[PDB]
Design a protein around this ligand. Structure first.
Ligand SMILES: Nc1nc2c(ncn2[C@@H]2O[C@H](CO)[C@@H](O)[C@H]2OP(=O)(O)O)c(=O)[nH]1
Ligand SMILES: [Ca+2]
Length: 104
């Protein structure tokens, strides 16, 4: 069973903490990867009710199981805060345009 289901992509807790740890490290060191400069601030335009406080940062999580290193980011993202607390896992899949919906 999936801990997080983003469209047709299946993720376990370990997939999420692994992706999150990589994004937080880059955030700490003030470095980015890719053309969209990840990790970057997640403004929460959609207004999700995250249990942890802002600011939020997004980092792509890949269905391949690999840690994002620069190519296409896919549609899924892990959202973490300043204290490296997981806010949630989101996706562009099933959302119009460049909007997001939470992964179930
Ligand atoms: N939909 C959405 N995009 C955001 C938000 N915060 C930052 N973004 C970024 O704002 C632009 C318009 O959506 C995109 O560059 C998107 O990039 P990502 O694809 O990297 O999320 C947010 O809260 N919602
Ligand atoms: Ca996996």
């Amino acid at each position: 069973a999936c801990d997080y289901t983003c469209g047709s992509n299946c993720y376990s807790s370990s997939d999420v903490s692994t992706a999150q740890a990589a994004g937080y490290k880059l955030h700490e060191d003030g470095e980015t990867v890719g053309s969209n400069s990840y990790p970057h601030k997640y403004n929460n335009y959609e207004g999700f009710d995250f249990s942890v406080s802002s600011p939020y940062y997004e980092w792509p999580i890949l269905s391949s199981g690999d840690v994002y290193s620069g190519g296409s980011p896919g549609a899924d993202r892990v959202v973490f805060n300043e204290n490296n607390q997981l806010a949630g896992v989101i996706t562009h899949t099933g959302a119009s345009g460049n909007n997001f919906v939470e992964c179930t």
